[PDB]
Design a protein around this ligand. Structure first.
Ligand SMILES: CC(=O)n1cc(Cl)c2c(Cl)c(C)ccc21
Ligand SMILES: *[C@@H]1O[C@H](CO)[C@@H](O)[C@H](O)[C@H]1NC(C)=O
Length: 358
């Protein structure tokens, strides 16, 4: 169990102005800190945020948050469930800003909602420094789905924050799970009414949230084009902190935004080629990502699932690959301890270790 702490700086808020927060389980005698960013899509205008407030309010407000949460997967403290970092200090940061962790805007006279995702991360880090993070050797900023994209948008800012605060010895790293999307053509075309094309949704959200992106990526794409930095293959090469990328090759959220709804019905030639081309494109974007884990499965999210240890690429599990990554960052490849694990087979579930969906 991780225990809730609402932020002492109550100016840093969820969408509705309630205080943001974090869940913490300390492990003193460990100098490893895992800060995990929850996912859960986003909202990008008044109407769709209002809808989200009605039926997904925990993603917009802390008013109903429970006092504890159970750490699962990479957040578990049991070695049996978490071979990788079971003894680390664990932090789960609830996603209550609906902005892919990019926002820097308060609720105000002009703003019905606050979008403070980027500031929530900074404030969590700041308040944790007084709770033991000041003694850290490694801070791994991890996240799934929108939280995985949030890692890509925020890992270098956390590094800069710690450097400016006088902690240059803390090694900041990122683990982005299921947040590496393609701005590809949809299988069928819709107008962005709610299934919005990748690019159109983000372009509107950034203006609505006052969204912020990493500085080097912002300088490349420049004013009006910062939406590009929400796409992993474009933002990743601009980052300086080590980032391990976990991405199913046939991610269900990617297929959803591509208007592919796998019905169980037979798959025709056009859709077969579309799906195979998606896998090949994702694989291609990971070719020069040295720390990656990309199984050929139709699924979504990995790292906080209790059975996250089960999937393997080329016989190596994700917890093992992450351990190999840790070794590779000690102060040349490692015999039998790989970090770059991308399936080459071309169809969902061609890897026998894929999640069953049971
Ligand atoms: C599932 C989710 O929260 N997502 C966050 C971002 Cl960003 C994103 C993108 Cl860019 C695509 C194309 C699809 C899903 C996405
Ligand atoms: C609270 O957070 C805001 C936004 O980051 C910051 O401007 C302000 O100085 C903080 N207040 C305190 C007391 O740290």
């Amino acid at each position: 169990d991780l225990r809730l702490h609402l932020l002492l700086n109550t100016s840093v808020t969820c969408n509705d102005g309630s205080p943001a927060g974090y869940y913490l389980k300390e492990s003193r005698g460990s100098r490893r800190w895992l800060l995990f960013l929850e996912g859960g899509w986003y909202c990008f205008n008044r109407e769709n945020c209002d809808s989200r407030y009605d039926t997904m309010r925990r993603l917009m407000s802390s008013r109903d948050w429970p006092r504890t949460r159970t750490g699962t997967g990479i957040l578990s403290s049991q070695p049996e469930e978490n071979p990788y970092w079971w003894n680390a200090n664990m932090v789960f940061i609830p996603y209550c800003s609906s902005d892919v962790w990019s926002g820097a805007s308060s609720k105000s006279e002009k703003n019905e909602y606050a979008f403070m995702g980027a500031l929530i991360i900074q404030e969590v880090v700041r308040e944790l420094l007084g709770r033991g993070l000041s003694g850290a050797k490694v801070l791994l900023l991890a996240g799934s789905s929108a939280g995985g994209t949030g890692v890509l948008l925020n890992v270098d800012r956390v590094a800069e924050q710690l450097e400016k605060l006088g902690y240059p010895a803390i090694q900041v790293r990122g683990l982005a799970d299921s947040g590496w999307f393609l701005d590809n053509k949809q299988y069928r075309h819709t107008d962005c009414v709610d299934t919005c094309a990748p690019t159109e949704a983000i372009r509107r959200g950034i203006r609505y949230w006052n969204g912020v992106v990493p500085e080097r990526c912002r300088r490349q794409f420049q004013e009006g084009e910062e939406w590009n930095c929400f796409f992993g293959y474009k933002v990743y090469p601009t980052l300086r902190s080590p980032v391990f990328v976990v991405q199913w090759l046939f991610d269900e959220a990617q297929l959803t935004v591509d208007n592919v709804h796998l019905t169980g019905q037979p798959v025709q030639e056009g859709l077969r080629l579309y799906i195979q081309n998606l896998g090949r494109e994702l694989r291609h974007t990971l070719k020069d990502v040295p720390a990656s884990f990309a199984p050929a499965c139709l699924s979504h999210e990995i790292i906080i699932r209790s059975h996250w240890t089960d999937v393997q690429v080329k016989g190596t599990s994700l917890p093992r690959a992450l351990h190999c990554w840790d070794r590779s960052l000690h102060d040349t490849p490692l015999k039998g301890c790989p970090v770059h694990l991308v399936d080459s087979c071309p169809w969902p579930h061609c890897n026998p270790s894929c999640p069953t969906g049971t």
